[PDB]
mmCIF file of C-alpha atoms and ligand atoms in Angstrom:
data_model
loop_
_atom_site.group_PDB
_atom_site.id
_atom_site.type_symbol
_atom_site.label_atom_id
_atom_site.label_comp_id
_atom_site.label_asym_id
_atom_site.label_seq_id
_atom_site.Cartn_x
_atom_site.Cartn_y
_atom_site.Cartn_z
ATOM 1 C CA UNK A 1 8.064 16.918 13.303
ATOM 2 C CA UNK A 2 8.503 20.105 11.524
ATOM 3 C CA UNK A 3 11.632 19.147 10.120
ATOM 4 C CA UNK A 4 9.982 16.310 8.085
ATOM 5 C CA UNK A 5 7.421 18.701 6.629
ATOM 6 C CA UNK A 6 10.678 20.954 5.353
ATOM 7 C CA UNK A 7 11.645 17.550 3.697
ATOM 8 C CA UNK A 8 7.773 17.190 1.965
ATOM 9 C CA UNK A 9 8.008 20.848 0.857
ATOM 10 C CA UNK A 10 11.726 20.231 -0.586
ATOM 11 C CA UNK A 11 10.197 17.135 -2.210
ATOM 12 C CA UNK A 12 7.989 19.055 -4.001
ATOM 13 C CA UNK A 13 10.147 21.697 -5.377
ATOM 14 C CA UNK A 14 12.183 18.990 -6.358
ATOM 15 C CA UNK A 15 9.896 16.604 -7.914
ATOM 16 C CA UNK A 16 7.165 19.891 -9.560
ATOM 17 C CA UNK A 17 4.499 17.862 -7.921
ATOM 18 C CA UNK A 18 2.465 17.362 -5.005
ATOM 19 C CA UNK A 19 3.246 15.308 -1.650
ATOM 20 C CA UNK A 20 0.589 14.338 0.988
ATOM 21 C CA UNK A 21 2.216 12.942 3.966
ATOM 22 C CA UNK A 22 0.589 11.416 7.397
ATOM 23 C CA UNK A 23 1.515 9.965 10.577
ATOM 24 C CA UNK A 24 -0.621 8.178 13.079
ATOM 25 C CA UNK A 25 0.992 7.086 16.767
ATOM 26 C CA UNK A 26 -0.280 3.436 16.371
ATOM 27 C CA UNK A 27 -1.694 3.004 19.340
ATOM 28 C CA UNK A 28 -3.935 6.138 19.597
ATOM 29 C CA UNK A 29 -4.527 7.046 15.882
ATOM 30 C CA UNK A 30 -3.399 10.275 16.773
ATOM 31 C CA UNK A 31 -2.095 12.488 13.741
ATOM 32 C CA UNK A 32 1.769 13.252 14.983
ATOM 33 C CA UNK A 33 2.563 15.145 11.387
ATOM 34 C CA UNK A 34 0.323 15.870 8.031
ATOM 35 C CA UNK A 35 0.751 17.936 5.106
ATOM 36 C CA UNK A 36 -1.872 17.772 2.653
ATOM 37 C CA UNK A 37 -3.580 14.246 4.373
ATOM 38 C CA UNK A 38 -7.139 15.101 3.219
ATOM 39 C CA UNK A 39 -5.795 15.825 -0.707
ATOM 40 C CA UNK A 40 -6.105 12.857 -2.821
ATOM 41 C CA UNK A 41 -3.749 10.314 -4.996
ATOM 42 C CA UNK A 42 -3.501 7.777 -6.615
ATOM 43 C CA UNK A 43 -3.194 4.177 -4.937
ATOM 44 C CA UNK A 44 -0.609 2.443 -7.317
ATOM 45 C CA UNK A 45 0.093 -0.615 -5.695
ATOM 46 C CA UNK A 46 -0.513 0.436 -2.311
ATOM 47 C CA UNK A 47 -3.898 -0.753 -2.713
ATOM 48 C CA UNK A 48 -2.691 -4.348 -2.622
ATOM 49 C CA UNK A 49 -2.883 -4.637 0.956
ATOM 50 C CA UNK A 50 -6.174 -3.667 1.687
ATOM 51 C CA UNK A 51 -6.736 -6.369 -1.227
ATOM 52 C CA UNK A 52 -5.255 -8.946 0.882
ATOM 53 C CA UNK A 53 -7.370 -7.598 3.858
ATOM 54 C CA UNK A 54 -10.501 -7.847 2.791
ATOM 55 C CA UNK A 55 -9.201 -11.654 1.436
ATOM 56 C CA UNK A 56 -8.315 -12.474 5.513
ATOM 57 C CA UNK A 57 -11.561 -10.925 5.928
ATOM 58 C CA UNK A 58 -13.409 -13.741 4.129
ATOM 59 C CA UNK A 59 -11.088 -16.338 5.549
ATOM 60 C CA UNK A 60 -12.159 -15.300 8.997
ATOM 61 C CA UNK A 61 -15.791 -15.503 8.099
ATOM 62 C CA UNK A 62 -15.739 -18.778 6.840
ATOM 63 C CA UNK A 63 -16.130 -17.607 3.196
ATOM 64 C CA UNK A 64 -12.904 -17.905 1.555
ATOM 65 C CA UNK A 65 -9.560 -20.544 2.138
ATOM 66 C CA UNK A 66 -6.143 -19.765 2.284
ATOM 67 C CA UNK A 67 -5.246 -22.930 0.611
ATOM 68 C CA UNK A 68 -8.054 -22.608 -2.399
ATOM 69 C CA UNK A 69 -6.410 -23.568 -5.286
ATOM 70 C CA UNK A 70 -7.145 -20.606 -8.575
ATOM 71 C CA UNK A 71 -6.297 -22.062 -12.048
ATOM 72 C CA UNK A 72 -5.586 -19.168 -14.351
ATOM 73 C CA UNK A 73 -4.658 -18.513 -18.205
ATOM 74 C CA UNK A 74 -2.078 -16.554 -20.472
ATOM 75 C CA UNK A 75 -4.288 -14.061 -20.830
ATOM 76 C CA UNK A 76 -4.465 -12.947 -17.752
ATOM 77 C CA UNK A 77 -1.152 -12.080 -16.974
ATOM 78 C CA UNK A 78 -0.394 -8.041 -17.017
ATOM 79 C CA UNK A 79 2.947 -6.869 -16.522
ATOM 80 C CA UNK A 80 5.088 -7.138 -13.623
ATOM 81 C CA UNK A 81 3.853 -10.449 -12.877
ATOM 82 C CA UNK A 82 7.213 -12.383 -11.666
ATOM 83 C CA UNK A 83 5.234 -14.542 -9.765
ATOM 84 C CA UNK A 84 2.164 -15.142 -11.787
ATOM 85 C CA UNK A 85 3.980 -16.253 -14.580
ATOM 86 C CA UNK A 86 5.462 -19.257 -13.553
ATOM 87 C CA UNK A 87 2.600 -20.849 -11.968
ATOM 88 C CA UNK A 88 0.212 -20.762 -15.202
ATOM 89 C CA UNK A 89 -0.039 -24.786 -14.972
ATOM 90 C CA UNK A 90 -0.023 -25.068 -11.809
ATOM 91 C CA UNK A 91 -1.856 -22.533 -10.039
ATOM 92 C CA UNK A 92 -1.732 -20.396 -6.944
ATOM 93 C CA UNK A 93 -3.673 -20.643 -3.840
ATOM 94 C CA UNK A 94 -4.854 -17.758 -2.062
ATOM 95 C CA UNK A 95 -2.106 -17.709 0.391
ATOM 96 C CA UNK A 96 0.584 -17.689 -2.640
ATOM 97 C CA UNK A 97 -1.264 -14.886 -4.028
ATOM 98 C CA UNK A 98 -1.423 -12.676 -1.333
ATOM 99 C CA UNK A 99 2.305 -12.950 -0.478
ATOM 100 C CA UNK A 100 3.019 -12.387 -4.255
ATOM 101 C CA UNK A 101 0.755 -9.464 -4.709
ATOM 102 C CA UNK A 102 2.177 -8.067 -1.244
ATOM 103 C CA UNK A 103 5.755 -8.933 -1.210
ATOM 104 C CA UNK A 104 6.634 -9.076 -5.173
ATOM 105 C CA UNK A 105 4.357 -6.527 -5.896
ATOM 106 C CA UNK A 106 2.414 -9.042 -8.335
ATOM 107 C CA UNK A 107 0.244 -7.528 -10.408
ATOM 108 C CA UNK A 108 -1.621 -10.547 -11.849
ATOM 109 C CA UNK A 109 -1.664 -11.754 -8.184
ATOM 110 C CA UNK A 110 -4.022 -8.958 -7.663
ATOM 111 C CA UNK A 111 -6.410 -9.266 -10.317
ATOM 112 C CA UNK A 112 -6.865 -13.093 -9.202
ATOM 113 C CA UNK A 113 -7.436 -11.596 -5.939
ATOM 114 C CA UNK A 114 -9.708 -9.142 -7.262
ATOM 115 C CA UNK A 115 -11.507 -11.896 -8.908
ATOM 116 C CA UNK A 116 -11.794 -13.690 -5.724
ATOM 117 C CA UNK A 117 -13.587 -11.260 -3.839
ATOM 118 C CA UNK A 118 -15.633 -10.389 -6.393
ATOM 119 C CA UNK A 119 -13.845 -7.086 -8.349
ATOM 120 C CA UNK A 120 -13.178 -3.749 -7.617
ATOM 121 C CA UNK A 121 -16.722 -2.231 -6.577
ATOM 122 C CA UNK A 122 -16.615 -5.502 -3.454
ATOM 123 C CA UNK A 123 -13.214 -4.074 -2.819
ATOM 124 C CA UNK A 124 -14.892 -0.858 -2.561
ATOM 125 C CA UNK A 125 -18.042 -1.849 -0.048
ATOM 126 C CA UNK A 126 -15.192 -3.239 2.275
ATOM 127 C CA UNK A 127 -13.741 0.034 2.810
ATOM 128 C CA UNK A 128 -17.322 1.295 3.279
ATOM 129 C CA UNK A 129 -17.925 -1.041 5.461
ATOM 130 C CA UNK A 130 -15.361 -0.648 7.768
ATOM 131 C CA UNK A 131 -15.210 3.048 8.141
ATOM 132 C CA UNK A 132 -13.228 4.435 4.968
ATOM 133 C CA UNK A 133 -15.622 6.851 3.538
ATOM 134 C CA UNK A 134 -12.714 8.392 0.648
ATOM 135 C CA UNK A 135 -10.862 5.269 -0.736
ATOM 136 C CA UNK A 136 -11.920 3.798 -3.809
ATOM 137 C CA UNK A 137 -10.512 1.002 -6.427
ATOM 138 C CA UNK A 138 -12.177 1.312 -9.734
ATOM 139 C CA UNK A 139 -9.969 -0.931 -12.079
ATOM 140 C CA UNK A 140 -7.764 -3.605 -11.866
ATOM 141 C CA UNK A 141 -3.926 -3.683 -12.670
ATOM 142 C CA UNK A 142 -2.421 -2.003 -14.924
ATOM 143 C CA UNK A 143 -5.171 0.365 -15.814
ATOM 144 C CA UNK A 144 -5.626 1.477 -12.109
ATOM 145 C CA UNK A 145 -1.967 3.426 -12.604
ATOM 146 C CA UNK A 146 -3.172 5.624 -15.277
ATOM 147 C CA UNK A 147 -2.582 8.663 -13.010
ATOM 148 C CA UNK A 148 -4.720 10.406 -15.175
ATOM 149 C CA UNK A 149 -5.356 14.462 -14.826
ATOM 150 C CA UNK A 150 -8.395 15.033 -13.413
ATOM 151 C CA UNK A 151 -9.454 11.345 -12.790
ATOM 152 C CA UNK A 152 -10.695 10.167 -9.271
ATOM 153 C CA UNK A 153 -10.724 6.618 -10.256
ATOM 154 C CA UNK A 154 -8.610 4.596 -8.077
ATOM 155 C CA UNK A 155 -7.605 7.307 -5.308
ATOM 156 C CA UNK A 156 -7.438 7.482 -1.748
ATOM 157 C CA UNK A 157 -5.975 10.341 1.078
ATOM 158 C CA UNK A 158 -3.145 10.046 2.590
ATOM 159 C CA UNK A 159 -5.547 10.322 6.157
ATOM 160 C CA UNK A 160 -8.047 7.686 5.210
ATOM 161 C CA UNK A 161 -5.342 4.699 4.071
ATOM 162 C CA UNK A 162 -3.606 5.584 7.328
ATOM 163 C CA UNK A 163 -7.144 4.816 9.086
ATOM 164 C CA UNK A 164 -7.734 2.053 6.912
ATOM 165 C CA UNK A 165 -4.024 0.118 7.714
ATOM 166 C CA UNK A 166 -4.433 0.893 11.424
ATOM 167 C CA UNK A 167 -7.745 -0.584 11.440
ATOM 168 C CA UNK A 168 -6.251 -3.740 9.768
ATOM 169 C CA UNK A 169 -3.023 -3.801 11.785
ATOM 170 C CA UNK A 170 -4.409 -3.379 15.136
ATOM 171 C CA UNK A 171 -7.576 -4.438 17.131
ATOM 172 C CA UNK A 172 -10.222 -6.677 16.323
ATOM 173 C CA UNK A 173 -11.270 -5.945 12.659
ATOM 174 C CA UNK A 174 -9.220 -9.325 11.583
ATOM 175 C CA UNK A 175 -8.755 -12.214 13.849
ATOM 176 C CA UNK A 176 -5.355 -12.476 15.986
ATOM 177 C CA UNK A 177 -4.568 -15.059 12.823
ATOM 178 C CA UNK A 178 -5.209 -12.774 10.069
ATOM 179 C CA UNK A 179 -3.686 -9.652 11.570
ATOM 180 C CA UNK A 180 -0.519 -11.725 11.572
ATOM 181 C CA UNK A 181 -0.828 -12.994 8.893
ATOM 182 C CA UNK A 182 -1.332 -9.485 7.014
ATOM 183 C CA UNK A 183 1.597 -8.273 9.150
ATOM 184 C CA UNK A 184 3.796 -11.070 7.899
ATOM 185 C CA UNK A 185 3.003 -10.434 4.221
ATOM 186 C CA UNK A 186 3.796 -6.601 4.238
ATOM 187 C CA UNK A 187 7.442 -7.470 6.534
ATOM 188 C CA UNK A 188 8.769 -10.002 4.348
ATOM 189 C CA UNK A 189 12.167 -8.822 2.628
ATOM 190 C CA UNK A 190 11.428 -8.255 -0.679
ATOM 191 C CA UNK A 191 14.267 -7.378 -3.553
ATOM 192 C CA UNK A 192 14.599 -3.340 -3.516
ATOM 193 C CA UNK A 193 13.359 -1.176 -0.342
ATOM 194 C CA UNK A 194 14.212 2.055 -1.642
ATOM 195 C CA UNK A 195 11.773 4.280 0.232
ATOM 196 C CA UNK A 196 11.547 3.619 3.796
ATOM 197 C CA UNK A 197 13.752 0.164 4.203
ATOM 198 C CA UNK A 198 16.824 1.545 3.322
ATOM 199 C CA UNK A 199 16.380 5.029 6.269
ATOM 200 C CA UNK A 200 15.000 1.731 8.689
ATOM 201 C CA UNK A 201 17.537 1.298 11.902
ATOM 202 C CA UNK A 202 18.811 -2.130 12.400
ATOM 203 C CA UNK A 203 16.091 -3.700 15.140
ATOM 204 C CA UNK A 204 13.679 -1.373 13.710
ATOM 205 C CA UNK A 205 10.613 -3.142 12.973
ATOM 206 C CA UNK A 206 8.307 -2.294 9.317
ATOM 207 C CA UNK A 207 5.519 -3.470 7.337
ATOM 208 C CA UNK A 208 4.876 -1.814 4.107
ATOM 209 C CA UNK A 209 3.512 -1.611 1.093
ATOM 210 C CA UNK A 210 5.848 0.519 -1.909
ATOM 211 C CA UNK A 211 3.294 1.209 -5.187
ATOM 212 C CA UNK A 212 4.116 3.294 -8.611
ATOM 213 C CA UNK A 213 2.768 3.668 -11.329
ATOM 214 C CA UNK A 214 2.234 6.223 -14.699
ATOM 215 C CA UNK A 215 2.749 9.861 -14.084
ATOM 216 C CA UNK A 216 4.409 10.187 -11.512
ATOM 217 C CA UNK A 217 2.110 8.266 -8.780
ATOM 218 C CA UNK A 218 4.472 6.598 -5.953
ATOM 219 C CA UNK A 219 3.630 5.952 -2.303
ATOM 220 C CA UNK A 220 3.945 3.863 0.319
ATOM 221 C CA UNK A 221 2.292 2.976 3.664
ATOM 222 C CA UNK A 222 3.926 1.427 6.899
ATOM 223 C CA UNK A 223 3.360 0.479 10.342
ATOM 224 C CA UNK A 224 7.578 1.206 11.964
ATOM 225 C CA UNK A 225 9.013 1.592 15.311
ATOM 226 C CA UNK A 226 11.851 0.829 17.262
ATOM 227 C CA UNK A 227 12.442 -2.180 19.444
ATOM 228 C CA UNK A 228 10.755 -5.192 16.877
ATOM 229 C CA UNK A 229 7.333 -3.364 17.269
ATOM 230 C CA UNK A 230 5.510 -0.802 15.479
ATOM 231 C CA UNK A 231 4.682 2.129 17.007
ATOM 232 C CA UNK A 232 3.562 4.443 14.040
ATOM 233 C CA UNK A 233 1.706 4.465 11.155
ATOM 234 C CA UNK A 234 3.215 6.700 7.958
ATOM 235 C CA UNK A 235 1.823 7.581 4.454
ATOM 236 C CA UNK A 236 3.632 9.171 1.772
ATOM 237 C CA UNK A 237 2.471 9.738 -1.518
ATOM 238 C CA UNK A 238 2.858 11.545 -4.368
ATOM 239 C CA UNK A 239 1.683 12.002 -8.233
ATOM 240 C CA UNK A 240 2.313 14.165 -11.385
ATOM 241 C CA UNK A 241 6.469 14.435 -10.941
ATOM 242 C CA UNK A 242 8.688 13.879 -14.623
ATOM 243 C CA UNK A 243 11.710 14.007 -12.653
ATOM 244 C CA UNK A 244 13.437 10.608 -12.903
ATOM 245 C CA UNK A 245 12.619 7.777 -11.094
ATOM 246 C CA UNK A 246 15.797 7.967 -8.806
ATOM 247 C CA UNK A 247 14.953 11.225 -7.961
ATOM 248 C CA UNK A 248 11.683 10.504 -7.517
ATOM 249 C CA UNK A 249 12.946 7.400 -5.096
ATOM 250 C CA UNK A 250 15.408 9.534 -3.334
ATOM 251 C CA UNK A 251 13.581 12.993 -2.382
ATOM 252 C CA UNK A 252 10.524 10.449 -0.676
ATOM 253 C CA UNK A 253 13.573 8.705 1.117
ATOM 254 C CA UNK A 254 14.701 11.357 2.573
ATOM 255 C CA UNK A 255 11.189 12.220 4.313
ATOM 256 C CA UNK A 256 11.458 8.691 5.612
ATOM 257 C CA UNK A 257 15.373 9.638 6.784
ATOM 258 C CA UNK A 258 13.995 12.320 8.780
ATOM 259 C CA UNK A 259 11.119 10.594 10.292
ATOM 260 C CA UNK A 260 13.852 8.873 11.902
ATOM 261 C CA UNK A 261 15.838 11.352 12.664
ATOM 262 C CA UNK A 262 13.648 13.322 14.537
ATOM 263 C CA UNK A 263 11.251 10.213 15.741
HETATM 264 CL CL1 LIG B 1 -1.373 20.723 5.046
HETATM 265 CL CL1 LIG B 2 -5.508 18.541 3.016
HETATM 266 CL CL1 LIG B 3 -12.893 -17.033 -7.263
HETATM 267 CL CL1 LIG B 4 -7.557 6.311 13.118
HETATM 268 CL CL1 LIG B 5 10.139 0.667 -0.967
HETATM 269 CL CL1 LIG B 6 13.475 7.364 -15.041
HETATM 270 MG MG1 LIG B 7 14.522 21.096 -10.089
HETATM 271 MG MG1 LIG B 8 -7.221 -23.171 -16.894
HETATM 272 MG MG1 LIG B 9 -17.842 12.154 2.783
HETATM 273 MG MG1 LIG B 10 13.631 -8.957 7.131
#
């Protein structure tokens, strides 16, 4: 609606930096709303879905297990690893990672995930594979939030992720199982919702995905509607801002407020 591209444009005067912003009616893929969807940004921790994806991927071909057991050390915990680091005994299995890297944002989570399918450039052939021709994920966490000037390296558009999620959320690409699954991960309540969950109507359904990271980066991706079902997909992201982080926080909040305002 043109009243949430108003709120994009006042984001960016706010924030001195870019925002690309897309949304797909679920059902159709139609675009509803866009402002620069075909520009690129950083993935932060966005990317950790389509992580998990091409996990449920393997699961449904018989090439991976949910309840596979990974042993890990010190050393590989990063920061903002909540989860991670209090299973370094112990363990994770798949299914533990996935809902840490999803829900807690785990960043260790992910890099055992990574691991698991094989790294970054497997990550990559996935997205190939099933249609994404822009995405890419070059480096694991942290280094894949450098935000850097200039830098391709772990990017995507705010059109292609939007693809990419309805492609996992919807139709065949994942069994019934998965899909679920993957839909389950992303809905779970997690501690702080500042971008969309806190605009989201009570009944309203959402899965998402919040990321940040260095220079600015921010963005998240959801499948919302009314009623306890999604009905539309919606990327927002974001990179280069100094502003603070609340500001940050609050100026992509209010795109989400009037999203559902004028839904
Ligand atoms: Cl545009
Ligand atoms: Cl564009
Ligand atoms: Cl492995
Ligand atoms: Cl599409
Ligand atoms: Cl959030
Ligand atoms: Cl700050
Ligand atoms: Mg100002
Ligand atoms: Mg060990
Ligand atoms: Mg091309
Ligand atoms: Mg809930």
């Amino acid at each position: 609606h043109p009243e949430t591209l108003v709120k994009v444009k006042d984001a960016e005067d706010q924030l001195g930096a870019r925002v690309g912003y897309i949304e797909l009616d679920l059902n159709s893929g139609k675009i509803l709303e866009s402002f620069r969807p075909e520009e690129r940004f950083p993935l932060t921790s966005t990317f950790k879905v389509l992580l998990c994806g091409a996990v449920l991927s393997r699961v449904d071909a018989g090439q991976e297990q949910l309840g596979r057991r990974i042993h890990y050390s010190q050393n590989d915990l990063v920061e903002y690893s909540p989860v991670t680091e209090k299973h370094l005994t112990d363990g994770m299995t798949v299914r533990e990672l996935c809902s840490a890297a999803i829900t807690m944002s785990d960043n260790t989570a992910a890099n055992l995930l990574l691991t698991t399918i094989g790294g970054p450039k497997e990550l990559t052939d996935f997205l190939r594979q099933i249609g994404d021709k822009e995405t890419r994920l070059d480096r694991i966490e942290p280094d894949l939030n450098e935000g850097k000037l200039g830098d391709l390296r772990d990017t995507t558009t705010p059109k292609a992720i939007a693809s990419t999620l309805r492609k996992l959320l919807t139709g065949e690409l994942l069994t019934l199982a998965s899909r679920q699954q993957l839909i389950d991960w992303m809905e779970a309540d997690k501690v702080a919702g500042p971008l969309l969950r806190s605009a989201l109507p009570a009944g309203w359904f959402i899965a998402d995905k919040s990321g940040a990271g260095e220079r600015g980066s921010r963005g998240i991706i959801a499948a919302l509607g009314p009623d306890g079902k999604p009905s539309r997909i919606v990327v927002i992201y974001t990179t280069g801002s100094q502003a603070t982080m609340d500001e940050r926080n609050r100026q992509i909040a209010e795109i989400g407020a009037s999203l559902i305002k004028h839904w």
